[PDB]
């Protein structure tokens, strides 16, 4: 399935959520 890029469009919605709670952790 040619969805490699489609992931970069969701993978960010997840990472941005994993790297956002860390920097703002407490």
Curated annotation (Swiss-Prot):
N-glycosylated. Phosphorylated; cAMP treatment promotes phosphorylation and activates the channel. Dephosphorylation decreases the ATPase activity (in vitro). Phosphorylation at PKA sites activates the channel. Phosphorylation at PKC sites enhances the response to phosphorylation by PKA. Phosphorylated by AMPK; this inhibits channel activity. It is found in: Apical cell membrane; Early endosome membrane; Cell membrane; Recycling endosome membrane. Monomer; does not require oligomerization for channel activity. May form oligomers in the membrane. Interacts with SLC26A3, SLC26A6 and NHERF1. Interacts with SHANK2. Interacts with MYO6. Interacts (via C-terminus) with GOPC (via PDZ domain); this promotes CFTR internalization and thereby decreases channel activity. Interacts with SLC4A7 through NHERF1. Found in a complex with MYO5B and RAB11A. Interacts with ANO1. Interacts with SLC26A8. Interacts with AHCYL1; the interaction increases CFTR activity. Interacts with CSE1L. Binds and hydrolyzes ATP via the two cytoplasmic ABC transporter nucleotide-binding domains. The two ATP-binding domains interact with each other, forming a head-to-tail dimer. Normal ATPase activity requires interaction between the two domains. The first ABC transporter nucleotide-binding domain has no ATPase activity by itself. Belongs to the ABC transporter superfamily. ABCC family. CFTR transporter (TC 3.A.1.202) subfamily. Epithelial ion channel that plays an important role in the regulation of epithelial ion and water transport and fluid homeostasis. Mediates the transport of chloride ions across the cell membrane. Possesses an intrinsic ATPase activity and utilizes ATP to gate its channel; the passive flow of anions through the channel is gated by cycles of ATP binding and hydrolysis by the ATP-binding domains. The ion channel is also permeable to HCO(3)(-); selectivity depends on the extracellular chloride concentration. This is Cystic fibrosis transmembrane conductance regulator. It comes from Ovis aries (Sheep).
